[PDB]
């Protein structure tokens, strides 16, 4: 009955509304859940949660990374009408905003529902509107009534959706990216029996805004080998050719070879990539190869840290990423945690040396 | 008969197929060739080759950088038809892919030729196709037959072209960027008689994917003054005005004042820029000023290292960059090595101080 | 090990650069190779090579035709810049010219490589350029330097590609059309043990420029039954429906029922068509039916000769026709020669009479 344990952890984390820069609700909980399984634990400057397991050897340092932040919207202006105007946080696209229900939170504590509306059809062409033409409806008739609700410019809004079950293996919610990867990280932390190498478990901030938290968190820790856990695109929907699927739901986590931007986001360190594959294989964990032409994860800037950090990514397949409607397959999450647990367990101080290279002289 | 020595070195390096992340074939050789001329030599984490010459003084540190990687294609899907689909590595443009012959290499060792084909004309408009409509033809009728060939998703492909001579001064090949600059670096390494200052010779990785190797390599070395050697655009072809040429073949290496992106790639440290010019001048080496509105080299992120690194670029003029068909002028390469040799030789511990600036107090 | 014998013959013929009107290099060799197997042999006015086998009967005359010429480019103007402008020979399309390497030959003997270049991207839209915007780069800085290279207006250029092997059954080169059919013809000439009927073996000129050599060659010979051997379109690539493939590689030569131009190129004489099929069938040679809506071969104007000539076509399937990158399947060539050998062997003076028709009176 592991399935139920995953779902409940995910409901806990995805009902928390924490878009980039605002992650404190999730930030709190993650610390709580992380606490017993770690030797040392802290929250850094930017609010990264850092757990630490010293394992048994003099060994080395391996880091595991997942981001807490989700996309969302900043309320930017408040109309005299009482309506709210927004600007996006991260990779938000307007198709996902139309006739959607939203939760706004209150510079202090509270939560009001709102509705993203449109001009009506009579003002022939559709034509997804533009953000500046969108507005949020919280049920107020004035700016005064809004202020009186406690909501101020700068308050964030987030998709109003809670986990629902799609058949036996799959689920829907907002904010699977990356809460799903926090979950996977956290739940590999439980399965963990000790290991040669020191493990840093890091739940990061501000990734959707372009990998900011993962950049800084890694600088102070600087480990030998880092591992990112993020979602990755799955196009195995209809009207798409099998060549453009990139991953399939329920076919296992995706070990990343390349992602984004004419490559250039990350081409993962082949030796970490090679490692992950042979482990999965020998442990008969199902897996996929992530070779993708768009998007990037924490590992883009981690592998760029200092002299360099051998880095790779375990990515979990997700449909309709960056919508309220994202879909994930629970088996992909289970095997995700397994492949993570193994990676840490099977890591050795000797293997961590290839990796830093000779000295021919 | 220097001309012949350059060509053969270039054939050696450009017949090596090493797109970004995959540079190991070149990586090997460069080490070999670099070995005798260096005091200390090693390959770092990411596979950067680093040679070290200690010269005679307590002096300082100057670094020289060239990238080994070339653009190419990842095979992404394998059709049941037996055809291969690709996604690009670096700055690949579709015009260069049409009816081109390609070499695919084999996750283990081997090399199969392939053909990049198109839908036929009958499916009026041309209309350069899109990458997703392209496919590679290796002569197989099935996915099975492909796997049996040893080629897997993730295997890279590269232009099939070997050096050819265009008249007396010029040559064609794939991957001039940057193998031509490795060559120049390597061949200035030979001409080198000692010097006051410590010299780090670095053949870098993953530049086409946006300067990744040069970022990390420089962090651990951190030198006072760095020098990039890259190709730069030459438009001196027909149907282009003399104002948009930017450089001419056979007119000498291009000392970089500015490149890219509304500037913003690099505006080279004027004092290193000034230095390079006065040296070239006094040594009557022909040269050009590289002032360009697109593209960037290693020196963009090198000059950004730590407190900053005085940095400049010797760029060699190249026609049709990022094609199988690139053209280079051998004189530009010869004078390139000369201007590099001089720069290192003429560098002094005293000059290396201006450069870090006063202290008024 | 027949496979190797075909390849080497093809390398010999396709490394010969002989576009329409210029076929002399191929013209020479074909004569050489044809010589031992023929009774009488000669080269006519236009340079057609004509071999003659008298077989054993008073019998009749059957002719076999293949064209030596390939598409190419005439250098038309020579810029002061030193660049060359071209106009096409035959059915050349601009998509095949972009970033292609070319061989120019020298009104007297010699061969210089050249590069077909383009305006750079900055002069949004691609937009395959137009021939008048293309130029060839031979590495020269002046018209003077070009003339000094011996290259004059009127000199032809041709794709620079030599045979490469794609897996076990298939190969790439320029000029498969029709050198592949010369090869097939030539190699059926070897397998030939005598026959009732007189055989004329003809390697023709200027077909890509619209069947000129086949028109004149046949007039003086005038035979009863003629056979063309040409390539034909194979679309069995991706993104094309099985209804538009027209032929498949490795499925056998294509006996032609109809080709081109709302038919109108050739509707082959059904009795020769019928003949070819029943022979292939009974001899269990694999074959295809060529029913096509574009393109035409020598047999269009042969069947039009004098009172008429019963005519048909054995066509060999080819992918990416009229590119540097054409692909052919060696089995299609082997069975092509077999079906040719049979046709000649199985031909009889009695069968040659149906064919000329009654006289009811």
PDB file of N, CA and C in Angstrom, chain B residues 83 85 95-96 98-101 113 115 117-122 126-128 135 137-141 160-162 164 166-167 170 172 235-240 246 319-320 323-325, chain C residues 83 85 95-96 98-101 113 115 117-122 126-128 135 137-141 160-162 164 166-167 170 172 235-240 246 319-320 323-325:
ATOM      1  N   UNK B  83      14.465   4.483 -40.051  1.00  0.00           N
ATOM      2  CA  UNK B  83      14.996   5.838 -40.130  1.00  0.00           C
ATOM      3  C   UNK B  83      15.234   6.444 -38.762  1.00  0.00           C
ATOM      4  N   UNK B  85      15.535   9.970 -36.289  1.00  0.00           N
ATOM      5  CA  UNK B  85      15.140  11.353 -36.086  1.00  0.00           C
ATOM      6  C   UNK B  85      16.149  11.999 -35.196  1.00  0.00           C
ATOM      7  N   UNK B  95      19.174  24.796 -42.965  1.00  0.00           N
ATOM      8  CA  UNK B  95      19.674  24.950 -44.314  1.00  0.00           C
ATOM      9  C   UNK B  95      20.895  24.096 -44.555  1.00  0.00           C
ATOM     10  N   UNK B  96      21.669  23.859 -43.514  1.00  0.00           N
ATOM     11  CA  UNK B  96      22.891  23.116 -43.702  1.00  0.00           C
ATOM     12  C   UNK B  96      22.669  21.623 -43.725  1.00  0.00           C
ATOM     13  N   UNK B  98      20.198  19.832 -45.476  1.00  0.00           N
ATOM     14  CA  UNK B  98      19.448  19.273 -46.580  1.00  0.00           C
ATOM     15  C   UNK B  98      20.335  18.563 -47.568  1.00  0.00           C
ATOM     16  N   UNK B  99      20.054  17.286 -47.808  1.00  0.00           N
ATOM     17  CA  UNK B  99      20.783  16.444 -48.759  1.00  0.00           C
ATOM     18  C   UNK B  99      22.254  16.388 -48.406  1.00  0.00           C
ATOM     19  N   UNK B 100      22.495  16.231 -47.116  1.00  0.00           N
ATOM     20  CA  UNK B 100      23.829  16.144 -46.579  1.00  0.00           C
ATOM     21  C   UNK B 100      24.155  14.743 -46.120  1.00  0.00           C
ATOM     22  N   UNK B 101      25.417  14.381 -46.230  1.00  0.00           N
ATOM     23  CA  UNK B 101      25.850  13.077 -45.819  1.00  0.00           C
ATOM     24  C   UNK B 101      26.441  13.205 -44.436  1.00  0.00           C
ATOM     25  N   UNK B 113      27.839   5.583 -42.151  1.00  0.00           N
ATOM     26  CA  UNK B 113      27.439   6.751 -42.902  1.00  0.00           C
ATOM     27  C   UNK B 113      25.937   6.776 -42.945  1.00  0.00           C
ATOM     28  N   UNK B 115      22.403   9.445 -44.492  1.00  0.00           N
ATOM     29  CA  UNK B 115      21.972  10.441 -45.446  1.00  0.00           C
ATOM     30  C   UNK B 115      20.776  11.193 -44.869  1.00  0.00           C
ATOM     31  N   UNK B 117      17.614  13.018 -45.494  1.00  0.00           N
ATOM     32  CA  UNK B 117      16.663  13.127 -46.579  1.00  0.00           C
ATOM     33  C   UNK B 117      15.457  13.988 -46.283  1.00  0.00           C
ATOM     34  N   UNK B 118      14.609  14.151 -47.287  1.00  0.00           N
ATOM     35  CA  UNK B 118      13.452  15.017 -47.196  1.00  0.00           C
ATOM     36  C   UNK B 118      12.238  14.335 -47.812  1.00  0.00           C
ATOM     37  N   UNK B 119      11.038  14.795 -47.469  1.00  0.00           N
ATOM     38  CA  UNK B 119       9.879  14.482 -48.279  1.00  0.00           C
ATOM     39  C   UNK B 119      10.203  14.916 -49.691  1.00  0.00           C
ATOM     40  N   UNK B 120       9.672  14.210 -50.691  1.00  0.00           N
ATOM     41  CA  UNK B 120       9.925  14.678 -52.053  1.00  0.00           C
ATOM     42  C   UNK B 120       9.112  15.928 -52.366  1.00  0.00           C
ATOM     43  N   UNK B 121       9.350  16.554 -53.526  1.00  0.00           N
ATOM     44  CA  UNK B 121       8.630  17.793 -53.842  1.00  0.00           C
ATOM     45  C   UNK B 121       7.123  17.613 -53.912  1.00  0.00           C
ATOM     46  N   UNK B 122       6.667  16.419 -54.266  1.00  0.00           N
ATOM     47  CA  UNK B 122       5.234  16.240 -54.322  1.00  0.00           C
ATOM     48  C   UNK B 122       4.771  15.609 -53.033  1.00  0.00           C
ATOM     49  N   UNK B 126       9.063  25.787 -51.467  1.00  0.00           N
ATOM     50  CA  UNK B 126      10.320  25.536 -50.738  1.00  0.00           C
ATOM     51  C   UNK B 126      10.864  26.866 -50.208  1.00  0.00           C
ATOM     52  N   UNK B 127      10.825  27.195 -48.903  1.00  0.00           N
ATOM     53  CA  UNK B 127      10.515  26.393 -47.698  1.00  0.00           C
ATOM     54  C   UNK B 127      11.525  25.298 -47.327  1.00  0.00           C
ATOM     55  N   UNK B 128      12.610  25.750 -46.711  1.00  0.00           N
ATOM     56  CA  UNK B 128      13.488  24.898 -45.933  1.00  0.00           C
ATOM     57  C   UNK B 128      12.694  24.156 -44.874  1.00  0.00           C
ATOM     58  N   UNK B 135      15.023  13.272 -41.531  1.00  0.00           N
ATOM     59  CA  UNK B 135      15.338  11.956 -41.036  1.00  0.00           C
ATOM     60  C   UNK B 135      16.665  11.501 -41.583  1.00  0.00           C
ATOM     61  N   UNK B 137      18.988   8.394 -43.062  1.00  0.00           N
ATOM     62  CA  UNK B 137      18.896   7.119 -43.770  1.00  0.00           C
ATOM     63  C   UNK B 137      20.242   6.388 -43.694  1.00  0.00           C
ATOM     64  N   UNK B 138      20.306   5.324 -42.902  1.00  0.00           N
ATOM     65  CA  UNK B 138      21.528   4.546 -42.773  1.00  0.00           C
ATOM     66  C   UNK B 138      21.510   3.261 -43.592  1.00  0.00           C
ATOM     67  N   UNK B 139      20.428   3.032 -44.329  1.00  0.00           N
ATOM     68  CA  UNK B 139      20.308   1.873 -45.197  1.00  0.00           C
ATOM     69  C   UNK B 139      19.643   0.664 -44.571  1.00  0.00           C
ATOM     70  N   UNK B 140      18.884   0.899 -43.511  1.00  0.00           N
ATOM     71  CA  UNK B 140      18.253  -0.163 -42.745  1.00  0.00           C
ATOM     72  C   UNK B 140      16.768  -0.174 -42.990  1.00  0.00           C
ATOM     73  N   UNK B 141      16.166  -1.347 -42.899  1.00  0.00           N
ATOM     74  CA  UNK B 141      14.734  -1.467 -43.078  1.00  0.00           C
ATOM     75  C   UNK B 141      13.959  -1.587 -41.782  1.00  0.00           C
ATOM     76  N   UNK B 160      29.592  14.568 -42.736  1.00  0.00           N
ATOM     77  CA  UNK B 160      30.644  13.808 -43.355  1.00  0.00           C
ATOM     78  C   UNK B 160      31.306  14.658 -44.414  1.00  0.00           C
ATOM     79  N   UNK B 161      32.426  15.250 -44.037  1.00  0.00           N
ATOM     80  CA  UNK B 161      33.274  15.991 -44.937  1.00  0.00           C
ATOM     81  C   UNK B 161      34.670  15.930 -44.366  1.00  0.00           C
ATOM     82  N   UNK B 162      35.665  15.792 -45.236  1.00  0.00           N
ATOM     83  CA  UNK B 162      37.052  15.800 -44.833  1.00  0.00           C
ATOM     84  C   UNK B 162      37.699  16.954 -45.528  1.00  0.00           C
ATOM     85  N   UNK B 164      39.399  19.539 -47.815  1.00  0.00           N
ATOM     86  CA  UNK B 164      39.742  19.657 -49.210  1.00  0.00           C
ATOM     87  C   UNK B 164      40.413  20.991 -49.402  1.00  0.00           C
ATOM     88  N   UNK B 166      41.068  24.469 -51.372  1.00  0.00           N
ATOM     89  CA  UNK B 166      40.531  25.409 -52.351  1.00  0.00           C
ATOM     90  C   UNK B 166      41.624  26.349 -52.756  1.00  0.00           C
ATOM     91  N   UNK B 167      42.173  26.149 -53.941  1.00  0.00           N
ATOM     92  CA  UNK B 167      43.360  26.873 -54.340  1.00  0.00           C
ATOM     93  C   UNK B 167      44.535  26.676 -53.393  1.00  0.00           C
ATOM     94  N   UNK B 170      43.482  28.354 -49.143  1.00  0.00           N
ATOM     95  CA  UNK B 170      42.249  28.139 -48.413  1.00  0.00           C
ATOM     96  C   UNK B 170      41.844  26.692 -48.407  1.00  0.00           C
ATOM     97  N   UNK B 172      38.502  23.693 -47.048  1.00  0.00           N
ATOM     98  CA  UNK B 172      37.155  23.396 -46.582  1.00  0.00           C
ATOM     99  C   UNK B 172      37.146  22.234 -45.648  1.00  0.00           C
ATOM    100  N   UNK B 235      31.875  37.505 -43.865  1.00  0.00           N
ATOM    101  CA  UNK B 235      30.816  37.637 -44.869  1.00  0.00           C
ATOM    102  C   UNK B 235      31.268  38.121 -46.227  1.00  0.00           C
ATOM    103  N   UNK B 236      32.569  38.148 -46.488  1.00  0.00           N
ATOM    104  CA  UNK B 236      33.117  38.756 -47.703  1.00  0.00           C
ATOM    105  C   UNK B 236      32.719  38.026 -48.993  1.00  0.00           C
ATOM    106  N   UNK B 237      31.711  37.184 -48.891  1.00  0.00           N
ATOM    107  CA  UNK B 237      30.971  36.655 -50.035  1.00  0.00           C
ATOM    108  C   UNK B 237      30.141  37.683 -50.861  1.00  0.00           C
ATOM    109  N   UNK B 238      29.663  37.283 -52.049  1.00  0.00           N
ATOM    110  CA  UNK B 238      28.802  38.110 -52.905  1.00  0.00           C
ATOM    111  C   UNK B 238      27.398  38.382 -52.397  1.00  0.00           C
ATOM    112  N   UNK B 239      26.849  39.525 -52.788  1.00  0.00           N
ATOM    113  CA  UNK B 239      25.516  39.913 -52.364  1.00  0.00           C
ATOM    114  C   UNK B 239      25.464  40.464 -50.958  1.00  0.00           C
ATOM    115  N   UNK B 240      26.635  40.737 -50.411  1.00  0.00           N
ATOM    116  CA  UNK B 240      26.757  41.359 -49.119  1.00  0.00           C
ATOM    117  C   UNK B 240      27.606  42.592 -49.290  1.00  0.00           C
ATOM    118  N   UNK B 246      32.407  42.059 -41.967  1.00  0.00           N
ATOM    119  CA  UNK B 246      32.953  41.939 -40.610  1.00  0.00           C
ATOM    120  C   UNK B 246      34.410  41.495 -40.552  1.00  0.00           C
ATOM    121  N   UNK B 319      34.384  31.497 -43.381  1.00  0.00           N
ATOM    122  CA  UNK B 319      33.189  31.602 -44.189  1.00  0.00           C
ATOM    123  C   UNK B 319      32.259  30.436 -43.963  1.00  0.00           C
ATOM    124  N   UNK B 320      30.964  30.688 -43.992  1.00  0.00           N
ATOM    125  CA  UNK B 320      29.958  29.653 -43.864  1.00  0.00           C
ATOM    126  C   UNK B 320      30.111  28.878 -42.597  1.00  0.00           C
ATOM    127  N   UNK B 323      28.585  24.970 -40.996  1.00  0.00           N
ATOM    128  CA  UNK B 323      28.120  24.177 -42.109  1.00  0.00           C
ATOM    129  C   UNK B 323      29.119  23.048 -42.288  1.00  0.00           C
ATOM    130  N   UNK B 324      28.852  22.113 -43.206  1.00  0.00           N
ATOM    131  CA  UNK B 324      29.874  21.134 -43.555  1.00  0.00           C
ATOM    132  C   UNK B 324      30.959  21.761 -44.405  1.00  0.00           C
ATOM    133  N   UNK B 325      30.604  22.924 -44.903  1.00  0.00           N
ATOM    134  CA  UNK B 325      31.271  23.612 -45.974  1.00  0.00           C
ATOM    135  C   UNK B 325      32.149  24.827 -45.551  1.00  0.00           C
TER     136      UNK B 325
ATOM    137  N   UNK C  83      34.386  34.772 -57.301  1.00  0.00           N
ATOM    138  CA  UNK C  83      33.307  33.798 -57.185  1.00  0.00           C
ATOM    139  C   UNK C  83      32.697  33.451 -58.528  1.00  0.00           C
ATOM    140  N   UNK C  85      29.276  32.100 -60.787  1.00  0.00           N
ATOM    141  CA  UNK C  85      27.828  31.999 -60.864  1.00  0.00           C
ATOM    142  C   UNK C  85      27.488  30.888 -61.800  1.00  0.00           C
ATOM    143  N   UNK C  95      17.271  23.102 -53.539  1.00  0.00           N
ATOM    144  CA  UNK C  95      17.421  22.495 -52.234  1.00  0.00           C
ATOM    145  C   UNK C  95      18.660  21.635 -52.162  1.00  0.00           C
ATOM    146  N   UNK C  96      19.051  21.060 -53.282  1.00  0.00           N
ATOM    147  CA  UNK C  96      20.181  20.165 -53.255  1.00  0.00           C
ATOM    148  C   UNK C  96      21.504  20.891 -53.308  1.00  0.00           C
ATOM    149  N   UNK C  98      22.493  23.713 -51.455  1.00  0.00           N
ATOM    150  CA  UNK C  98      22.861  24.540 -50.325  1.00  0.00           C
ATOM    151  C   UNK C  98      23.918  23.894 -49.470  1.00  0.00           C
ATOM    152  N   UNK C  99      25.039  24.586 -49.287  1.00  0.00           N
ATOM    153  CA  UNK C  99      26.163  24.137 -48.463  1.00  0.00           C
ATOM    154  C   UNK C  99      26.687  22.804 -48.953  1.00  0.00           C
ATOM    155  N   UNK C 100      26.797  22.716 -50.267  1.00  0.00           N
ATOM    156  CA  UNK C 100      27.286  21.533 -50.929  1.00  0.00           C
ATOM    157  C   UNK C 100      28.666  21.746 -51.504  1.00  0.00           C
ATOM    158  N   UNK C 101      29.445  20.685 -51.534  1.00  0.00           N
ATOM    159  CA  UNK C 101      30.776  20.761 -52.065  1.00  0.00           C
ATOM    160  C   UNK C 101      30.731  20.252 -53.486  1.00  0.00           C
ATOM    161  N   UNK C 113      38.127  21.748 -56.372  1.00  0.00           N
ATOM    162  CA  UNK C 113      36.967  21.667 -55.515  1.00  0.00           C
ATOM    163  C   UNK C 113      36.434  23.059 -55.333  1.00  0.00           C
ATOM    164  N   UNK C 115      32.870  25.335 -53.300  1.00  0.00           N
ATOM    165  CA  UNK C 115      31.879  25.330 -52.249  1.00  0.00           C
ATOM    166  C   UNK C 115      30.714  26.223 -52.664  1.00  0.00           C
ATOM    167  N   UNK C 117      27.982  28.504 -51.636  1.00  0.00           N
ATOM    168  CA  UNK C 117      27.654  29.286 -50.463  1.00  0.00           C
ATOM    169  C   UNK C 117      26.409  30.133 -50.592  1.00  0.00           C
ATOM    170  N   UNK C 118      26.059  30.804 -49.506  1.00  0.00           N
ATOM    171  CA  UNK C 118      24.845  31.590 -49.435  1.00  0.00           C
ATOM    172  C   UNK C 118      25.123  32.923 -48.754  1.00  0.00           C
ATOM    173  N   UNK C 119      24.251  33.907 -48.956  1.00  0.00           N
ATOM    174  CA  UNK C 119      24.221  35.049 -48.064  1.00  0.00           C
ATOM    175  C   UNK C 119      24.056  34.504 -46.663  1.00  0.00           C
ATOM    176  N   UNK C 120      24.626  35.183 -45.666  1.00  0.00           N
ATOM    177  CA  UNK C 120      24.401  34.696 -44.305  1.00  0.00           C
ATOM    178  C   UNK C 120      22.982  35.000 -43.840  1.00  0.00           C
ATOM    179  N   UNK C 121      22.585  34.485 -42.669  1.00  0.00           N
ATOM    180  CA  UNK C 121      21.209  34.706 -42.210  1.00  0.00           C
ATOM    181  C   UNK C 121      20.867  36.174 -42.014  1.00  0.00           C
ATOM    182  N   UNK C 122      21.860  36.994 -41.696  1.00  0.00           N
ATOM    183  CA  UNK C 122      21.543  38.392 -41.520  1.00  0.00           C
ATOM    184  C   UNK C 122      21.856  39.128 -42.799  1.00  0.00           C
ATOM    185  N   UNK C 126      13.664  31.667 -44.098  1.00  0.00           N
ATOM    186  CA  UNK C 126      14.262  30.626 -44.954  1.00  0.00           C
ATOM    187  C   UNK C 126      13.156  29.688 -45.446  1.00  0.00           C
ATOM    188  N   UNK C 127      12.715  29.693 -46.717  1.00  0.00           N
ATOM    189  CA  UNK C 127      13.248  30.340 -47.938  1.00  0.00           C
ATOM    190  C   UNK C 127      14.584  29.800 -48.469  1.00  0.00           C
ATOM    191  N   UNK C 128      14.475  28.667 -49.152  1.00  0.00           N
ATOM    192  CA  UNK C 128      15.502  28.194 -50.061  1.00  0.00           C
ATOM    193  C   UNK C 128      15.827  29.262 -51.088  1.00  0.00           C
ATOM    194  N   UNK C 135      26.494  31.091 -55.319  1.00  0.00           N
ATOM    195  CA  UNK C 135      27.787  31.288 -55.925  1.00  0.00           C
ATOM    196  C   UNK C 135      28.717  30.171 -55.532  1.00  0.00           C
ATOM    197  N   UNK C 137      32.553  28.986 -54.475  1.00  0.00           N
ATOM    198  CA  UNK C 137      33.779  29.471 -53.844  1.00  0.00           C
ATOM    199  C   UNK C 137      34.917  28.473 -54.090  1.00  0.00           C
ATOM    200  N   UNK C 138      35.861  28.835 -54.951  1.00  0.00           N
ATOM    201  CA  UNK C 138      36.994  27.971 -55.241  1.00  0.00           C
ATOM    202  C   UNK C 138      38.265  28.384 -54.508  1.00  0.00           C
ATOM    203  N   UNK C 139      38.176  29.428 -53.691  1.00  0.00           N
ATOM    204  CA  UNK C 139      39.299  29.888 -52.892  1.00  0.00           C
ATOM    205  C   UNK C 139      40.144  30.971 -53.530  1.00  0.00           C
ATOM    206  N   UNK C 140      39.568  31.667 -54.498  1.00  0.00           N
ATOM    207  CA  UNK C 140      40.274  32.677 -55.269  1.00  0.00           C
ATOM    208  C   UNK C 140      39.798  34.053 -54.891  1.00  0.00           C
ATOM    209  N   UNK C 141      40.681  35.031 -55.001  1.00  0.00           N
ATOM    210  CA  UNK C 141      40.319  36.400 -54.699  1.00  0.00           C
ATOM    211  C   UNK C 141      40.047  37.249 -55.924  1.00  0.00           C
ATOM    212  N   UNK C 160      30.379  16.940 -55.377  1.00  0.00           N
ATOM    213  CA  UNK C 160      31.507  16.181 -54.908  1.00  0.00           C
ATOM    214  C   UNK C 160      31.035  15.198 -53.862  1.00  0.00           C
ATOM    215  N   UNK C 161      30.830  13.969 -54.301  1.00  0.00           N
ATOM    216  CA  UNK C 161      30.511  12.860 -53.437  1.00  0.00           C
ATOM    217  C   UNK C 161      30.993  11.612 -54.136  1.00  0.00           C
ATOM    218  N   UNK C 162      31.543  10.674 -53.372  1.00  0.00           N
ATOM    219  CA  UNK C 162      31.973   9.400 -53.900  1.00  0.00           C
ATOM    220  C   UNK C 162      31.180   8.348 -53.195  1.00  0.00           C
ATOM    221  N   UNK C 164      29.553   5.711 -50.913  1.00  0.00           N
ATOM    222  CA  UNK C 164      29.689   5.260 -49.551  1.00  0.00           C
ATOM    223  C   UNK C 164      28.689   4.155 -49.336  1.00  0.00           C
ATOM    224  N   UNK C 166      25.842   2.205 -47.216  1.00  0.00           N
ATOM    225  CA  UNK C 166      24.869   2.316 -46.134  1.00  0.00           C
ATOM    226  C   UNK C 166      24.401   0.941 -45.772  1.00  0.00           C
ATOM    227  N   UNK C 167      24.884   0.422 -44.657  1.00  0.00           N
ATOM    228  CA  UNK C 167      24.651  -0.966 -44.323  1.00  0.00           C
ATOM    229  C   UNK C 167      25.150  -1.936 -45.385  1.00  0.00           C
ATOM    230  N   UNK C 170      22.831  -1.264 -49.404  1.00  0.00           N
ATOM    231  CA  UNK C 170      22.542   0.011 -50.031  1.00  0.00           C
ATOM    232  C   UNK C 170      23.756   0.894 -50.091  1.00  0.00           C
ATOM    233  N   UNK C 172      25.292   5.152 -51.327  1.00  0.00           N
ATOM    234  CA  UNK C 172      25.065   6.544 -51.685  1.00  0.00           C
ATOM    235  C   UNK C 172      26.064   7.017 -52.687  1.00  0.00           C
ATOM    236  N   UNK C 235       9.816   6.738 -52.998  1.00  0.00           N
ATOM    237  CA  UNK C 235       9.422   7.618 -51.895  1.00  0.00           C
ATOM    238  C   UNK C 235       9.249   6.939 -50.555  1.00  0.00           C
ATOM    239  N   UNK C 236       9.693   5.697 -50.413  1.00  0.00           N
ATOM    240  CA  UNK C 236       9.424   4.894 -49.217  1.00  0.00           C
ATOM    241  C   UNK C 236      10.088   5.439 -47.946  1.00  0.00           C
ATOM    242  N   UNK C 237      10.521   6.681 -48.009  1.00  0.00           N
ATOM    243  CA  UNK C 237      10.868   7.484 -46.838  1.00  0.00           C
ATOM    244  C   UNK C 237       9.698   7.849 -45.875  1.00  0.00           C
ATOM    245  N   UNK C 238      10.018   8.360 -44.676  1.00  0.00           N
ATOM    246  CA  UNK C 238       9.029   8.822 -43.693  1.00  0.00           C
ATOM    247  C   UNK C 238       8.247  10.073 -44.052  1.00  0.00           C
ATOM    248  N   UNK C 239       7.026  10.162 -43.540  1.00  0.00           N
ATOM    249  CA  UNK C 239       6.168  11.301 -43.814  1.00  0.00           C
ATOM    250  C   UNK C 239       5.506  11.248 -45.171  1.00  0.00           C
ATOM    251  N   UNK C 240       5.601  10.092 -45.805  1.00  0.00           N
ATOM    252  CA  UNK C 240       4.943   9.845 -47.060  1.00  0.00           C
ATOM    253  C   UNK C 240       4.096   8.609 -46.889  1.00  0.00           C
ATOM    254  N   UNK C 246       5.565   4.774 -54.642  1.00  0.00           N
ATOM    255  CA  UNK C 246       5.740   4.393 -56.047  1.00  0.00           C
ATOM    256  C   UNK C 246       6.648   3.189 -56.267  1.00  0.00           C
ATOM    257  N   UNK C 319      16.248   6.517 -54.094  1.00  0.00           N
ATOM    258  CA  UNK C 319      15.815   7.545 -53.174  1.00  0.00           C
ATOM    259  C   UNK C 319      16.567   8.836 -53.388  1.00  0.00           C
ATOM    260  N   UNK C 320      15.891   9.957 -53.224  1.00  0.00           N
ATOM    261  CA  UNK C 320      16.502  11.267 -53.325  1.00  0.00           C
ATOM    262  C   UNK C 320      17.162  11.476 -54.648  1.00  0.00           C
ATOM    263  N   UNK C 323      20.147  14.367 -56.348  1.00  0.00           N
ATOM    264  CA  UNK C 323      20.832  15.007 -55.250  1.00  0.00           C
ATOM    265  C   UNK C 323      22.247  14.455 -55.236  1.00  0.00           C
ATOM    266  N   UNK C 324      23.113  14.971 -54.360  1.00  0.00           N
ATOM    267  CA  UNK C 324      24.411  14.334 -54.169  1.00  0.00           C
ATOM    268  C   UNK C 324      24.275  13.047 -53.384  1.00  0.00           C
ATOM    269  N   UNK C 325      23.111  12.942 -52.783  1.00  0.00           N
ATOM    270  CA  UNK C 325      22.794  12.010 -51.736  1.00  0.00           C
ATOM    271  C   UNK C 325      21.920  10.792 -52.159  1.00  0.00           C
TER     272      UNK C 325
END
